[PDB]
Amino acid sequence: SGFRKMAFPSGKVEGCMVQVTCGTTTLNGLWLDDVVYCPRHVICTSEDMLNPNYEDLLIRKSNHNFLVQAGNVQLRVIGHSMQNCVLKLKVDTANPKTPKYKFVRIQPGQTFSVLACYNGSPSGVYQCAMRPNFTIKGSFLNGSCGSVGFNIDYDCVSFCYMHHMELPTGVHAGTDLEGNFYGPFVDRQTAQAAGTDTTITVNVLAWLYAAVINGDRWFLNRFTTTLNDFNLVAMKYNYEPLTQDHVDILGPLSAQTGIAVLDMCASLKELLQNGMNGRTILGSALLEDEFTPFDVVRQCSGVT
Amino acid sequence: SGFRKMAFPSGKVEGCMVQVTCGTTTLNGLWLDDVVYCPRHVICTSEDMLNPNYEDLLIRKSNHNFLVQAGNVQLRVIGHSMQNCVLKLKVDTANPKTPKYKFVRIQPGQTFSVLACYNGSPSGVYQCAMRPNFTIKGSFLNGSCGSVGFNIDYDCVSFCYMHHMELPTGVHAGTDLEGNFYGPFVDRQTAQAAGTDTTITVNVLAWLYAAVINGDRWFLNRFTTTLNDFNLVAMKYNYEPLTQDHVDILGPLSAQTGIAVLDMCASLKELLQNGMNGRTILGSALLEDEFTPFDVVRQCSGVT
Numbered sequence A, B: 001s002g003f004r005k006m007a008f009p010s011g012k013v014e015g016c017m018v019q020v021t022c023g024t025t026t027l028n029g030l031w032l033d034d035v036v037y038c039p040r041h042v043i044c045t046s047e048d049m050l051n052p053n054y055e056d057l058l059i060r061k062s063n064h065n066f067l068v069q070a071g072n073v074q075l076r077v078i079g080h081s082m083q084n085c086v087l088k089l090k091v092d093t094a095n096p097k098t099p100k101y102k103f104v105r106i107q108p109g110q111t112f113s114v115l116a117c118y119n120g121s122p123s124g125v126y127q128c129a130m131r132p133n134f135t136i137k138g139s140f141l142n143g144s145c146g147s148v149g150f151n152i153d154y155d156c157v158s159f160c161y162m163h164h165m166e167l168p169t170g171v172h173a174g175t176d177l178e179g180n181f182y183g184p185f186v187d188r189q190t191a192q193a194a195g196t197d198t199t200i201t202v203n204v205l206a207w208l209y210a211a212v213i214n215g216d217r218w219f220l221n222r223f224t225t226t227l228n229d230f231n232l233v234a235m236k237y238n239y240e241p242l243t244q245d246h247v248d249i250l251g252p253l254s255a256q257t258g259i260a261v262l263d264m265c266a267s268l269k270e271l272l273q274n275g276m277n278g279r280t281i282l283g284s285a286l287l288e289d290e291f292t293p294f295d296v297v298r299q300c301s302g303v304t
């Protein structure tokens, strides 16, 4: 028992972190096989930042300008290329610590762990969700670019995010490992609109199931609702509309607790309409949406 | 910017996790140099659990009864001994992945990361605080015993906790790495009183400084208070009394923000007396006490 905002063990990803320096800029790189991936803005200077011409800036750079260091060992760069907003630096040595891995583009509302790094050195690990508006609310300071987000399925690391920027609002934006930004963001120091965000309804329901499993039950009521009725409340409270696909993903949790998904929706409806009345659920005084139904099942069964 | 409940990178500790089986019971062990540490209750059976005579139960066991497996490799046990509530199994091979390490007994109110493990395999990592009453509110299922808590100072891992039990209240208890329980707990399946707990005042203040640094400032007011006055409020709201030692530890945060510690106390006093009024601080709707002043400084400066 107990429910915590748990991150994946970061060991397999720590073994891939390197430092990348180009000119005066230092950030993090991800060394997998004989390739180091890093944000392309490592080639920018302070003036360039406002509207960089990345193709022109990269043409001024040669393999020897990319200084890549894995702790104490220096890597020899034998190729460089830009793919979307990432640079791929081919090195002459395959990372001996390369885990089994995949590059995946996650969906908004899915969760992942972030290994925050500075100068190629890991500082901490935390779990977070890709917001419906494609931003993440992380903890990143200057030098954290190139830190990655990932999930782990037994021995396979699926990298889903590489950190690129902090928007003027203090929220974070980045790319998949092919350098495509999540959301409308660009790697420029410009004010950029993040879409209207919503709360991830399916995750809040999953977390209400985690609460019941772990003994927090005060919010269960004598009511039920329909998807239509619930979605009118979700609309008023800026929650994602619930679909049958979300109900289907909550199936295992519904089966385990014996609480029908629409009955849990009626509990969530009453919490949205009345608040928590100064009470808590799993140590939180708000409705948590950073746990997917998969996360809840995994934590509640002890998956390694 | 951004502030997250960050755990230490778990790689150095993942490399130490092993599985220990004695009879029908399997739990986790910590392999450091040529010693494997694990909870002594690995030698109990269902009947024994209520009041085990550990000295007698261990006398029935020989080195060959302790099956220790590090992933796929089997370790050869050449000695066994009980120290307080831990067993130390001497093995014939020093762990090649042994990091620089220390065994420390943490103080109540201090924080640490837990690497939750099942069958010697890491499942996740989360940060938590040792409650003032010496319990932890973790996420542990059957098989998680032997999972450890730790802090990391650059390359040195200070192990401070080994998980032993879940109290009937769903809270967790364990020992330091010398097998001494934190708090009054014993390794028996008996109802056990956990002391009256309090909120870690110095940590809530540290977290209010983290909030101001990261832009959440709505709670700052035109008031000040004294340690005496603040401590009358702390008393009413079951917060730890604030001392000059706590004020001194908040010094760096006070210097960085320019907000005197007693002025932050007056903000905390108003939040205790009036609540959050449906607002949030760093994504939380309650007063968070799981970040020490050290944690706040480290996260706000990017320490690796």
Ligand SMILES: CC(=O)N1CCN(CC(=O)Nc2cnccc2C)CC1
Pocket (backbone or CB within 6 Å): A041, A044, A048, A049, A050, A052, A140, A141, A142, A143, A144, A145, A164, A165, A166, A167, A187, A188, A189, B001
């Ligand atoms: C070079 C360029 O066009 N830019 C504009 C500056 N950015 C730098 C940037 O966003 N850093 C950063 C990331 N995360 C947290 C904190 C900070 C300070 C990179 C992309």
Ligand SMILES: CC(=O)N1CCN(CC(=O)Nc2cnccc2C)CC1
Pocket (backbone or CB within 6 Å): A001, B041, B044, B048, B049, B050, B052, B140, B141, B142, B143, B144, B145, B164, B165, B166, B167, B187, B188, B189
């Ligand atoms: C052998 C003995 O005297 N006991 C009594 C049983 N306990 C087992 C125990 O507390 N397990 C556990 C730990 N954490 C979360 C969930 C569970 C189920 C070990 C100590």
